[PDB]
Amino acid sequence: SHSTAETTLDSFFSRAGLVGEIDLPLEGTERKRARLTPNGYANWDIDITGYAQMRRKVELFTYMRFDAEFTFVACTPTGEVVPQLLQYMFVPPGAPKPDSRESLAWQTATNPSVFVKLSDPPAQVSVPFMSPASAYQWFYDGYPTFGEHKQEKDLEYGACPNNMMGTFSVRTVGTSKSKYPLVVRIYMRMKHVRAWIPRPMRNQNYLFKANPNYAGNSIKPTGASRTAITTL
Amino acid sequence: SHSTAETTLDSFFSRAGLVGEIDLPLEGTERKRARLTPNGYANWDIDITGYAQMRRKVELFTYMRFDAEFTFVACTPTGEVVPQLLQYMFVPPGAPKPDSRESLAWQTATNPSVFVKLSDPPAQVSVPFMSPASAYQWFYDGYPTFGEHKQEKDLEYGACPNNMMGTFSVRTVGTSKSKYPLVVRIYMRMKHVRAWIPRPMRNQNYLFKANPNYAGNSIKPTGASRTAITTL
Amino acid sequence: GFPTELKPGTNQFLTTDDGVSAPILPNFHPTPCIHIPGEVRNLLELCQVETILEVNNVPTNATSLMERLRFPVSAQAGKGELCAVFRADPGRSGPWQSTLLGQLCGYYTQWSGSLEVTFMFTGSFMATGKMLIAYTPPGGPLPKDRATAMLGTHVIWDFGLQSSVTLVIPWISNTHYRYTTGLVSIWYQTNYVVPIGAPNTAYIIALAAAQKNFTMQLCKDASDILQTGT
Amino acid sequence: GFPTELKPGTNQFLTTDDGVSAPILPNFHPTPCIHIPGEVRNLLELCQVETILEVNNVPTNATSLMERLRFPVSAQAGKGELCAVFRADPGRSGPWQSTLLGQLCGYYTQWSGSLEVTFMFTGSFMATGKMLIAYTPPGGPLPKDRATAMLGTHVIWDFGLQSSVTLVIPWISNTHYRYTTGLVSIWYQTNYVVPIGAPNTAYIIALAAAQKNFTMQLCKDASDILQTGT
Amino acid sequence: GFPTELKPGTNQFLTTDDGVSAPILPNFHPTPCIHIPGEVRNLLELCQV
Amino acid sequence: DRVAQLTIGNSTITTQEAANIIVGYGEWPSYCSDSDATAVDKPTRPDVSVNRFYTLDTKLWEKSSKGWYWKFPDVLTETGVFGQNAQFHYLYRSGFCIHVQCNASKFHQGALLVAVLPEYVIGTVAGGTGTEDSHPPYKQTQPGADGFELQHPYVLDAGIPISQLTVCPHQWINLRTNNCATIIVPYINALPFDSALNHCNFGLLVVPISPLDYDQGATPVIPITITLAPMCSEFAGLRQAV
């Protein structure tokens, strides 16, 4: 034995994973369109669980803190590259997202935008630790809204809005629709990771994104033995 | 908290905003052509208020001083990129602008020009602080022409010609018209910002670019209460 | 022959990217700076300046717009509540939008710090009486009466002291914003007292600003208008 | 004019490449770290924490799932074998999958080091008796009887000592995996002895963890699920 | 904004070119060298046998 | 022969048992030298009145008990003077000395796992076989001083394996060996202060891992008594009316 660096949180967490994949077709008899339901422009909220194995992984801890490197690989659904100009716009948590291709949100300077071609190598940017709190939080045993208690007209329980990281709004530049069917795949890499309160690793299938709900058909991590006394 | 750097003038003012958008189509039955009405070449005066929110922002102060970084993103109205060679020519304030595609102004060396392709990444240049005065001036309580006084049949009050920053003349290189419909979008980022006399922030809708005129329907910043004694 | 590999995201144009681009006029020498008496280097300087707080944001007539900068007492009133109150929410819709601080918060997303509110009594010299200015922290409801308002943080303001009442609001926060605000109530401790010849109604002007521990975070352009090309 | 040749593999995007990319918000200053009481900096900290070892991975009913964390003795049994040998195979299918150690190995390819397994007797205070705990190194077969198990590495555990039996497994390795595991056996040295009034059946809880010499190598994501989009 | 001109023979792949390329597994730590009794560092050692 | 007294309420106790006292994450509760402005109206640090020995109603352990949990500070949120402070303040911060004790004979049997899990979010059933997202009521998320019983101890009612609950601050209560357990909890949050009534910083789990047993004739239910004392409780906020 010599080095234990592969079990640091950075080794464990840091590599670019395929988070989402935006789909931008042409016009015709196809459906749906979409996607993610852009009549001509997609809004994608930053969700680190876009990468499948990531949720169970990060839920090993209660609090986390990190930067994020985003990379944008764009092509036609055949993987062809075509001369099209794209806009990747970052909408910070507090800001309003575009609701159309003609939305004023697209020209709002405080939404940093990236203007890159498909012929250009994939775009790449860094997002800092965005929370108003001191750390992200995959578990919030309570109710964020501070009203007057005995009132839960909502089963909102367990959500924490301090984890909002922002939004990426994808678009082909121009006033007219693009001549090419496009796909934009978003990759994310966690950078400066710190984690705090370790907890048991997810034991059952996930049912919902926002809560630890499980099905009444509880299952074991594994039960291969016919009896404690045998081993085959 | 720890740092107050986001409220410095540079943080407040410095990011590339979409100032203007020059439009260059082909020939046929359309209207208008234009734009900004070029029978084959566009002249665009540097107007920092091209970006909508920018005027109210800078009018927080009376005097300002800065550099400007301009970026030119060019494409077809579909956002397609095409093999076209462009000329962006900077016409310094004192200089005569081109009046045709054949103007000698295009070859006047003291008008710095940029020759870049659409296939090339967007062009980028910096314009220095251009005023003959010590600072720019969003408010000029007086009359720039110094003739002799009771002489006012010219609507000039309030304008300052010392703020002239120059002109960008956009054009496709060549003696023959371009084969492609083009759009040139101009972005500006203020760089080394200093500001001097703070003043109340614009309270009413703007009516005109050159003066603070307002309509007789004066409106309040907001009056949501039905009375001071309630809180809805 | 210096070996080089171009990394992902080269030919991209990021609108917030801060690099050095080619100067258009290398030989041009800009007019040198002279000294100009006022200068601002950080917006927090402006946030620390008292501006008029439109507590009375009730009339919407062009001719009654000046009435939002004041709010009166009067000998008419008993010993109940003068005016309910501006949630200590400098960035939210309401009275605070009249202040430079509120308008500067409109260009940002998060803020945190302490606030000062100065109340100025512009009544007659001969006028006298006591008001109870009370602060109710977030989550709490408006105190039902003067008596229960008195049990919390409050200042009893007499008109032997003209305006030298500055209420200080301990802490404001946007850990959530992207009854969760403070409450600064004003009550009649006593009725309004005047001799013969003194007006039976007087007005208070409220001025507000942030303290030096106040900071704002995420820049964000929101707006009203700017003229179209015609 | 600085001369440059672009080397093979420029415009490529390598998902594991570690470079510095353009900050999307150069002027943004993230909320400063406060101190949070628990912090982990290396997963090996978690591998060193005893978690319950489901030696009894036999029942598969929702109502009987809690029975896998225990495994009993009883006065019934003679002097033969209590329960077979959880192969000392923290990364393989079986009992070890209940432990945090086993689940953490699932995110890696290779591991090597020593292991501890603590057995806790949760019987009556009045209960007494001796168990023989034996470890069999890889390649070796399960010892045919108690007598031949005694000839190897073993601990004789009496209930004058509650749980202070922690068996140490010398070494585990994955030089091959991408009878080749250790073997830990539990035998009745003596029968289970109780007086009148004491339950004739008691349960043992097994806790396991890795020692500080334990290391894992090649990172590798394996999984169960995560919810689909609707 | 650092000025650069790309010289002839950039995008070429020379099979004898010796540069440094991106590591596929940056966080991976290879099994450390142990001592092995025989070692050769130059083929001329074998020519002399 | 030892009687430990702190305040107005007094308790008789054996300590320190099999494994001494467990200090969660090796960190004692502290006041907050750091947070946050700091302003004049800043925290109100009471004791020893508020920070006293609170003893909850005893729970009865049965052969069939699945386990219980409590949420902090929700348990004391309506109890005595601490309950008063937590309700009529805006910001809250505290540590806790949690003490769990059994009374059983040398002829009784069993093992409890006593653990502390920060941000203990509950998940209920979505149908025995199905996907209906219903979220737990207040009676289950914030069960008050009376606590709540686990429906599925194996998954800690949150799809999370109890076999690994020992990653959390814990102490075993093995009737054979010891009858009591003590856990010390520091304030744990991503903020220095939070809402006492809307956020439960942690949950306290008490789960039988080895079931209670006895021959018939012995007392069929074993009492589990819980005494807890806040340690560096800190109340900012100010005035409030619920």
What residues of F are in contact with residue A158 (Cβ under 8 Å)? 121-122, 135
Pseudo-torsion of CA D136, D138, D142, D145, nearest 10°?
-30
Alpha-carbon distance of D49 to D34, in angstroms, equals 26
Pick the closest to residue B54 from B36, B66, B38 (CA basis): B66
Q: Which two tokens stand for residue D223?
A: 């999984």
Whether omega for the bond prior to residue D141 falls within 30 degrees of 0, making it cis, is no
Interface contacts A/F by beta carbons within 8 Å = 139
Alpha-carbon distance of C163 to C160, in angstroms, equals 9
Residue with tokens 């470079």: D19
Is C132 in contact with C154 (CB distance < 8 Å)? yes
Tell me the CA distances in angstroms from F215 to D72, D198, F106, one per residue in order.
17, 6, 12
Tell me the CA distances in angstroms from D21 to A100, A116, A187, C12, C17, one per residue in order.
30, 15, 13, 11, 11
Alpha-carbon distance of F69 to F151, in angstroms, equals 11
Optimal mutation site among F36, F119, F139, interface A, most CBs of chain A within 10 A: F119
Question: What letter represents residue C118's amino acid?
Answer: T
Alpha-carbon distance of B40 to B222, in angstroms, equals 47
- In what helix (H) or strand (E) does residue A18 lie, and over which residues does it extend? strand A17-24
Chain F CA closest to residue A138 = F119
Is C203 in contact with C66 (CB distance < 8 Å)? no
Shortest alpha-carbon distance between residue E13 and chain C (Å): 12
Is A51 in contact with A190 (CB distance < 8 Å)? no
- Cβ-nearest to E29 among A6, A10, A14: A6
Q: Do chains F and E touch (3 or more CB pairs under 8 A)?
A: no
Resolution in A: 3.1
Alpha-carbon distance of A90 to A27, in angstroms, equals 26
Question: What letter represents residue E10's amino acid?
Answer: T
Q: Which two tokens stand for residue F106?
A: 């040398």
Chain E CA closest to residue D11 = E11
Chain C CA closest to residue F190 = C175
Q: Helix, strand, coil % (nearest 5) of chain D?
A: 10, 35, 55
Q: Which two tokens stand for residue A197?
A: 């309160």
Q: Which two tokens stand for residue F209?
A: 């891992």
- In what helix (H) or strand (E) does residue B89 lie, and over which residues does it extend? strand B85-91
C73-105: b or e for each residue (b if 16 or more CB lie within 10 Å)? beeeeeeebbbbbbbbbbbbebbbbbbbbbbbb
Instruction: Write the burial class of residue B37 (CB in 10 Å: 0-12 exposed, 13-18 middle, 19+ buried).
Output: exposed
Is A14 in contact with A189 (CB distance < 8 Å)? yes
Alpha-carbon distance of D130 to D187, in angstroms, equals 9
Alpha-carbon distance of A45 to C202, in angstroms, equals 53
DSSP structural state of residue D163:
S
Interface contacts B/C by beta carbons within 8 Å = 179
Way the structure was solved: X-ray
Question: What letter represents residue D224's amino acid?
Answer: D
Alpha-carbon distance of D138 to D140, in angstroms, equals 5
Alpha-carbon distance of C182 to C95, in angstroms, equals 13
Task: Give B1's Cβ-side CA count (13 Å radius).
Answer: 25
B54-66: b or e for each residue (b if 16 or more CB lie within 10 Å)? bbbbbbbbbbbbb
Residue F21 φ/ψ region, left for φ over 0, alpha for ψ in the -120 to 50 degree band, beta for the rest = beta
Q: Is A11 on the interface with E (CB under 8 A)?
A: yes
Q: Is B216 on the interface with C (CB under 8 A)?
A: yes
Is B201 in contact with C98 (CB distance < 8 Å)? no
Is B198 in contact with C38 (CB distance < 8 Å)? yes
Task: Specify the 3-state DSSP secondary structure of F37.
Answer: coil
Handedness of CA F215, F216, F218, F219 (dihedral sign): positive
Task: Specify the 3-state DSSP secondary structure of A88.
Answer: strand
Question: What letter represents residue D95's amino acid?
Answer: P
Contact C139 F195 (CB under 8 A): yes
Contact F202 A133 (CB under 8 A): no
Residues in chain D: 230
Is D201 in contact with F214 (CB distance < 8 Å)? no
DSSP structural state of residue A214:
B
Alpha-carbon distance of F229 to A57, in angstroms, equals 35
Q: Is B7 on the interface with C (CB under 8 A)?
A: yes
Beta pairing partners, F208: F112
Task: Specify the 3-state DSSP secondary structure of C91.
Answer: coil
Alpha-carbon distance of A59 to D227, in angstroms, equals 15
Contact C21 E1 (CB under 8 A): yes
Contact E32 A2 (CB under 8 A): yes
Handedness of CA D175, D176, D179, D183 (dihedral sign): positive
Instruction: Write the burial class of residue C136 (CB in 10 Å: 0-12 exposed, 13-18 middle, 19+ buried).
Output: buried
What residues of E are in contact with residue A2 (Cβ under 8 Å)? 29, 32
D10-24: b or e for each residue (b if 16 or more CB lie within 10 Å)? ebebbeebbeebbbb
Whether omega for the bond prior to residue C212 falls within 30 degrees of 0, making it cis, is no
Phi then psi dihedrals of residue D105, to 5 deg = -70, -25
Alpha-carbon distance of F33 to F234, in angstroms, equals 12
| Direct distance between the N- and C-terminal alpha carbons of chain B, in angstroms, rounded to an integer | 32
Q: Which two tokens stand for residue D139?
A: 């390649």
Tell me the CA distances in angstroms from A155 to A138, B84, D37, F124, F174, one per residue in order.
17, 58, 30, 12, 39
Alpha-carbon distance of B160 to B135, in angstroms, equals 12
Instruction: Write the burial class of residue F75 (CB in 10 Å: 0-12 exposed, 13-18 middle, 19+ buried).
Output: buried
Task: Specify the 3-state DSSP secondary structure of B85.
Answer: strand
Phi then psi dihedrals of residue C96, to 5 deg = -65, -15
Q: Is B11 on the interface with D (CB under 8 A)?
A: yes
- In what helix (H) or strand (E) does residue F86 lie, and over which residues does it extend? helix F80-87
Tally of helices (H runs) and strands (E runs) in chain D: 3, 12
Question: Chain A, 134-163: which have a CB under 8 Å from a chain C CB?
Answer: 144-148, 161-162
Q: Is C10 on the interface with E (CB under 8 A)?
A: no
CB count, 10 Å around CB of B212?
14
Query: After what residues is chain C interrupted, C–N > 2.5 A?
Result: 178
Task: Specify the 3-state DSSP secondary structure of D97.
Answer: helix
Tell me the CA distances in angstroms from B181 to B172, E22, F76, one per residue in order.
11, 42, 72
Is A116 in contact with A188 (CB distance < 8 Å)? no
Q: Per the structure, how many domains does chain D have?
A: 1
What residues of C are in contact with residue E7 (Cβ under 8 Å)? 1
Is C162 in contact with C129 (CB distance < 8 Å)? no
Q: Which two tokens stand for residue C16?
A: 């917030």
Pick the closest to residue D201 from F140, A19, F110 (CA basis): F110
Pick the closest to residue F204 from F89, F126, F128, F114 (CA basis): F114
3-state SS, B117-130, equals ECCCCCEEEEECCC
Instruction: Write the burial class of residue F6 (CB in 10 Å: 0-12 exposed, 13-18 middle, 19+ buried).
Output: middle
Alpha-carbon distance of D174 to D182, in angstroms, equals 12
Alpha-carbon distance of F158 to F170, in angstroms, equals 19
Task: Specify the 3-state DSSP secondary structure of B12.
Answer: helix
What residues of E are in contact with residue D219 (Cβ under 8 Å)? 27
Task: Give A2's Cβ-side CA count (13 Å radius).
Answer: 7
Pick the closest to residue C133 from C84, C71, C72, C95 (CA basis): C84
Q: Which two tokens stand for residue F56?
A: 């909850």
Alpha-carbon distance of D71 to D204, in angstroms, equals 5
Alpha-carbon distance of C23 to C33, in angstroms, equals 20
Question: F1-242 in CATH: which number?
Answer: 2.60.120.20
Per domain, the residue ranges of chain F are 1-242
Residues in chain E: 49
C94 contacts: CB under 8 Å, gap ≥ 6: B222, B224, B225, C57, C86, C87
Task: Give F235's Cβ-side CA count (13 Å radius).
Answer: 24
What residues of A are in contact with residue F141 (Cβ under 8 Å)? 141-142, 157
Contact B2 D29 (CB under 8 A): yes
* CATH code assigned at C124: 2.60.120.20
For A96-99, the CB contacts below 8 A with 24+ separation are A97/A43, A97/A167, A97/A169, A98/A41, A98/A43, A98/A169
Report DSSP letters for B196-216, one per residue: --B-----S----SSS----S
Whether omega for the bond prior to residue F36 falls within 30 degrees of 0, making it cis, is yes
Q: Which two tokens stand for residue D170?
A: 């010398």
Residue with tokens 């430079």: C100
Contact F41 C175 (CB under 8 A): no
Alpha-carbon distance of C129 to C126, in angstroms, equals 10
Is C132 in contact with C184 (CB distance < 8 Å)? no
Q: Which two tokens stand for residue A90?
A: 């970052």
B176 contacts: CB under 8 Å, gap ≥ 6: none
Q: Is A81 on the interface with F (CB under 8 A)?
A: no
Alpha-carbon distance of D181 to D90, in angstroms, equals 10
* CATH code assigned at B137: 2.60.120.20
Task: Give F176's Cβ-side CA count (13 Å radius).
Answer: 29
Residue B34 φ/ψ region, left for φ over 0, alpha for ψ in the -120 to 50 degree band, beta for the rest = left
Contact B221 C103 (CB under 8 A): yes
Question: Chain F, 49-108: which have a CB under 8 Å from a chain A CB?
Answer: 71
User: Chains contacting E with at least 3 CB pairs below 8 Å?
Assistant: A, C, D
Chain F CA closest to residue A150 = F138
Report DSSP letters for B142-155, one per residue: S-SS-S-SS---S-
What residues of A are in contact with residue B15 (Cβ under 8 Å)? 109-110, 112
Beta pairing partners, C40: B195
Beta pairing partners, C83: C186
Alpha-carbon distance of A189 to A193, in angstroms, equals 11
- Cβ-nearest to C178 among A110, A114, A164: A164
Tell me the CA distances in angstroms from D71 to A214, D122, D203, F189, F205, one per residue in order.
27, 10, 5, 38, 22
Optimal mutation site among A1, A6, A69, interface E, most CBs of chain E within 10 A: A6
Is F183 in contact with F227 (CB distance < 8 Å)? no
Handedness of CA B17, B20, B26, B29 (dihedral sign): positive
Q: Which two tokens stand for residue C1?
A: 């022959």
User: Beta strand A17-24 with B42-45: parallel, antiparallel or unpaired?
Assistant: unpaired
Q: What residues make up the domain containing A205? A: 1-232
Report DSSP letters for E17-32, one per residue: -------S-TT--PPP
Question: What radius of gyration do chain C's Cα atoms show?
Answer: 25
A196 contacts: CB under 8 Å, gap ≥ 6: A61, A62, A63, A64, A135, D36, D37, D38, D39, D40
Q: What residues make up the domain containing C215? A: 1-230
Is A8 in contact with A70 (CB distance < 8 Å)? no
Shortest alpha-carbon distance between residue C168 and chain B (Å): 19
Task: Give C190's Cβ-side CA count (13 Å radius).
Answer: 11
Alpha-carbon distance of D45 to A61, in angstroms, equals 13
Question: What letter represents residue A227's amino acid?
Answer: T
CB count, 10 Å around CB of C174?
21
F202-213 sheet: strands from edge to edge: F148-149, F68-72, F202-213, F109-118, F170-174
Alpha-carbon distance of B59 to B72, in angstroms, equals 26
D40 contacts: CB under 8 Å, gap ≥ 6: A9, A61, A195, A196, A198, D46
CB count, 10 Å around CB of B160?
17
